[PDB]
Symmetry: C2
Subunit: 620 residues, 2 copies
């Protein structure tokens, strides 16, 4: 269950496998088995980590459907592997992968956005090893994120009644048709590494929680006492683990030795007096050092954490008991040459842009992001809503057992991966599924989602709030969104409807606001905005101009400011990003308040000025 | 019935009324009629001719619904009006006008793209005269071009099932919702002038026709003999008219003196040897000078004309008996500050661009253009397909008698204004009306359009072919298009359907071309294309890039080159132009091969190269 990010220390070494690999495209539903047995013939170079789609302009890899195959060699010293447990970790391979080492199948994985690993202690050998990783990009009616099996991509144009068109569709080259509004970037999107733990007994998982705060200071910077809980799981095979709590200067401030009981597990609580709390805008981090004992140490793992509480109370969202206000946007992992490939230079810049804007939060629309971005947000005091790739879903999926299982896997796997970040305050279990309509459809959606909501509460030792991000729908027949712990709505009044009329758009919004006023749940925007081509200007700004985007936020934000129970504004989007090509996507989605190159459109300046005058705590 | 453009000479003077008029916005369904009795109060300046929408950036005149009132003063010497018939001509007031001169209502007009005039002999007086013109911009289900009474504009986005949207629509500010893909520019779009004829008897109309050509040269530059026919109508009240035919040097090469018979009319024929023929790419113009005899001259008009025949024969389009191929585009009367207002600097520049491109034709999409433009294409050898504003129609309109009358007025009024131009080779009676479907719908559309097809044939003394420009539809249940003289199809395979997939698009195209091969009529494109933002580039061009627009035409044009019966390629559009705002219109329609400022995109260079190798005659 545990997927602690590989660490190097006195018991453990991490050997990164990143670099420029060999690569070949292969078939729509096969690849040659002998490519895992001997060097790939006539290989193309491919950097990892990185999407493969934008790394070759001689090929049209954006159009590729099916498999591709990655390969490299690596050698490691014998004295490093001797006696150790050897683990090969894939931070992400999108969407599915088969992995081979020295011609032997290690195993397969499905789920493009969460890590998997393999024990390679016995397949490794001395000298050069040959690592082949076949990667399947296919999406469809049973994958998460959801592909369309036939027809068009999401928000695609059609003339389906034209006989020529129905006929030509039967014979068109097969391609992935996203039922989601971002490009289907594929491949070894995050890092690959070999790493070492002791073999006889090792730390397999840690979980740290904030159980209780007594007498939080008026400014929320400290509490008189913090009660944290620890849970350490071990693998392998009278034993003990020492747990030391380090403050932000590394000083030991608490420490206990705990008995390991046999799914070997040490569990307990620790009191921290004068604890320093973690807050949006004022991060503070501790470390939990777990040392498995035999003076010598058998195994060790340093787990970062932050001391804070999260609680929904009536129509308030309380962090360390203070009424928080979300200022932010949905993001994407998306950039010009990487595609969805992790890039920590961009993560760092993006976090400073978040501060420059005076935002305080974002959502991982629409898949768990690379692990380092959460470590960055823990240290920079940015709040995250962590979301699974359950985007594109409708009634066809709810009745599909394989989708339900993949959905539960993504939820468990996300929470297992990310449970220790203080910056995560809330989980999202889907983006824009079909929840409304008539007949049994609202109930069928409810019955699909209610156990997933429960599953997110039960997998999280911190028991954070759980939401479901809702599309623009008939809010009167949707019975699912209103039961979430926070209502998170995507609304495009004045863009996809009442187009360009901000008066009518604000009047429509207030009518739906009047509906949510009585539900008695905290409500926030998780999407709203307007496609905007930088450099299109007008004195009376129309759709696609910079002015219209600034006018859109100014008018919409003035409405929600009148609602005490509206606790957050996460717009769509932080930055322009790539989508499948289509008549409404001008080189992708252009709702960024920043360009794809992260430059600020007029609305970013206006939003930065508004957010500089809105406090994290106490705005409502 | 005739609308000869105002001409000055020994018997007639034209007094222009263009310039900077006074102006006011008024109400949605009314304006103050006492404004005709005195200077408009607190007036704005407004240049005439021109759309008013983009002449004031303090107000949002693009958003204006209803009436505006223009006004100016003018004075002329009494010795000029003395004894003369005084005609006040509006070349175009879009869409409807009430016209007042010195407080007297002169009358009203509907039809925003065709000239209309009033006899003011008895409403003029010495000194300053006060001219007041109310202009009505409203469109709806009984106008041509067609507006939508509720709902969205054409190609508009909606979320109609959201209750807040349905409720906000009831109270939204009224705006015109075009059922056509171009901005509803209104005002005194074309020139205003007062002109003189003799009162007692005057030339009222002139029509010249090329009746027959004997022994046309191999290169079609001359014929051994040409038979032309004249028809001169007079107003007012043993008389005669002298008709002289001047060649391009002004030499009288033929001439006749004809008897006038009462409705007063002179008609006859005139043989012209070694006649110099008007062809695409090689214009030649004659002048028919009509002189009303009493040695003195009572009245005179100089009517330009060109000698050429047009004939559809099987699957060929014959100009002077040679098989012609259309190269060109739909156009728009559209530019940055003028809106739809006429601009002769622009007309001259566009005609030079048509030459630069090696194009030979365009269509007047989707309304008759200004009269100067056709004179310019007469002298520059550019063929025109002339089209009425019947755009946006479906079954709702076919049962409306007010609309059917407007449609007959537009066809008769277009052809009466334009009959003499040799550059006009073909009439279009409608753009993209609903024609297909099931039940009685196809037959209803056929019963509506067939009398209009006959009316165009019978209004035109030259009896040129008539078409109807068809939208992308189910060509197997459309039964009207196939009965036109030439089949003119708007097709967006690979743009609005099969999006981005040029192989699938070309397959679909060929399936439809197989249908049309069996029909046996000459066929041509009148629209096809791809929105394109200049500067957007990719090595594998995706939609909106310049490379995609170029690849779109390369692939499509290689398919129609395989079809001998496919007689023309008029793409959409010559240049980017403004539309009602919406999610598919990035600052208007971007399918121009030129930008709105007439700069070549990549595709314009590619097309220029293809067209330079394609002859006007004999390519197929």
């Amino acid at each position: 269950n545990g997927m602690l990010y590989p660490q190097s220390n006195d018991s453990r070494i991490v050997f990164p496998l990143d670099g420029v690999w060999d690569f070949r495209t292969a078939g729509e539903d096969s690849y040659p088995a002998e490519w895992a047995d001997a060097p790939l013939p006539e290989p193309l170079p491919m950097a990892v980590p990185g999407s493969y789609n934008d790394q070759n302009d001689e090929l049209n890899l954006r159009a590729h459907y099916g498999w591709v195959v990655y390969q490299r060699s690596f050698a490691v010293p014998s004295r490093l592997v001797a006696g150790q447990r050897m683990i090969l970790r894939f931070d992400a391979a999108t969407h599915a992968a088969d992995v081979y080492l020295n011609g032997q199948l290690l195993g397969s994985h499905f789920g493009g956005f969460l890590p998997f690993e393999f024990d390679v202690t016995s397949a490794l050998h001395a000298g050069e090893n040959l690592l082949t990783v076949a990667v399947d990009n296919r999406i469809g009616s049973s994958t998460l994120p959801v592909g369309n099996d036939a027809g068009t991509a999401f928000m695609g144009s059609d003339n389906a009644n034209v006989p020529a068109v129905a006929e030509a569709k039967k014979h068109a080259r097969r391609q992935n048709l996203p039922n989601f509004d971002f490009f289907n970037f594929a491949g070894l999107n995050r890092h690959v590494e070999l790493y070492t733990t002791p073999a006889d007994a090792y730390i397999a998982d840690i979980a740290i929680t904030t159980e209780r705060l007594d007498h939080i200071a008026g400014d929320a910077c400290t509490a008189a006492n913090a009660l944290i809980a620890y849970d350490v799981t071990f693998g392998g095979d009278g034993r003990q683990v020492r747990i030391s709590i380090l403050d932000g200067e590394g000083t030991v401030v608490a420490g206990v030795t705990a008995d390991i009981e046999r799914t070997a597990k040490a569990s307990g609580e620790i009191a921290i007096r004068d604890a320093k709390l973690w807050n949006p805008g004022a991060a503070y981090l501790y470390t939990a050092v777990a040392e498995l004992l035999p003076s010598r140490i058998i195994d060790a793992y340093r787990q970062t954490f932050g001391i804070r509480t999260v609680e929904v109370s009536g129509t308030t969202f309380l962090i360390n008991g203070k009424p928080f206000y979300f200022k932010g946007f949905g993001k994407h992992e998306d950039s010009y040459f990487h595609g969805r490939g992790t890039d920590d230079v961009l993560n760092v810049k993006d976090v400073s842009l978040i501060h420059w804007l005076h935002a305080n939060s974002f959502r991982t629309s629409h898949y768990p992001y690379a692990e380092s971005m959460y470590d960055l947000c823990d240290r920079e005091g940015i709040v995250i809503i962590d979301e699974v790739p359950a985007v594109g879903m409708s009634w066809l999926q709810y009745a599909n057992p394989l989708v339900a299982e993949r959905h539960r896997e993504a939820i468990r796997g996300m929470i297992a991966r990310d449970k220790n970040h203080p910056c995560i305050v809330m989980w999202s279990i889907a983006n824009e599924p079909g929840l409304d309509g008539d007949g049994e459809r609202p109930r069928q959606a409810y019955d699909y989602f209610r156990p997933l909501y429960e599953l997110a509460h039960a997998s999280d030792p911190q028991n954070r709030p759980v939401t479901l991000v809702c599309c623009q729908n008939d809010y009167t027949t949707d019975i699912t969104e209103r039961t979430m712990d926070v209502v998170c709505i995507n609304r495009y009044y004045g863009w996809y409807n009442l187009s360009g009329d901000l008066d009518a758009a604000c009047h429509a919004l207030n009518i739906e606001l009047d509906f949510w006023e009585n539900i008695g749940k905290p409500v926030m925007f998780t999407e709203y905005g307007a496609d905007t081509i930088e450099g299109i200007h007008g004195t009376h700004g129309e759709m696609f101009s910079e002015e219209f985007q600034r006018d859109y936020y100014a008018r919409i934000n003035a409405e929600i400011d009148k609602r005490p129970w509206f606790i957050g504004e996460q717009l769509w989007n932080f930055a322009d990003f790539a989508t499948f090509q289509g008549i409404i996507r001008v080189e992708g989605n252009r709702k960024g308040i920043l360009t794809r190159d992260r430059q600020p459109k007029m609305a970013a300046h206006w939003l930065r000025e508004r957010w500089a005058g809105i406090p994290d705590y106490g705005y409502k």
